[PDB]
């Protein structure tokens, strides 16, 4: 698809340095990484404008990310807690557009 995240499923042990990655082929300038939770929806971690931006979304703590370049998007969780075991979608964006890749299921030991 034109948004692509790696790993698919992912298990961490408590503490671990985690990074997920997304690619995308839409050539958009808008990433945003969000978790998705029962009771909460979806809700926005970090997101990006371009190519070395990154700006905090709702619920930044414990999270950085890092946008290399136009394709790539990556989510770090700098030391995971089990708290932090959810459904990662990654999305591009222009206007009122979002496009989500697939998702990737964390959880952490």
Same mark, same amino acid.
């Given at each position: 698809?034109?948004?692509?995240?790696?790993?698919?499923?992912?298990?961490?042990?408590?503490?671990?340095?985690?990074?997920?990655?997304?690619?995308?082929?839409?050539?958009?300038?808008?990433?945003?990484?969000?978790?998705?939770?029962?009771?909460?929806?979806?809700?926005?971690? !970090?997101?990006?404008?371009?190519?070395?931006?990154?700006?905090?979304?709702?619920?930044?703590?414990?999270?950085?990310? #890092?946008?290399?370049? !136009?394709?790539?998007?990556?989510?770090?969780?700098?030391?995971?807690?089990? #708290?932090?075991?959810?459904?990662?979608?990654?999305?591009?964006?222009?206007?009122?557009?979002?496009?989500?890749?697939?998702?990737?299921?964390?959880?952490?030991?």
């Amino acid at each position: 698809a034109a948004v692509t995240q790696s790993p698919r499923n992912k298990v961490a042990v408590t503490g671990e340095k985690v990074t997920l990655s997304c690619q995308q082929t839409n050539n958009h300038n808008n990433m945003y990484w969000y978790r998705q939770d029962t009771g909460h929806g979806l809700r926005l971690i !970090h997101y990006s404008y371009g190519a070395g931006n990154t700006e905090k979304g709702d619920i930044p703590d414990g999270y950085e990310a #890092s946008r290399p370049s !136009h394709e790539q998007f990556s989510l770090i969780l700098v030391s995971a807690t089990p #708290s932090q075991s959810s459904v990662y979608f990654c999305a591009s964006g222009v206007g009122g557009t979002l496009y989500f890749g697939a998702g990737t299921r964390l959880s952490v030991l």
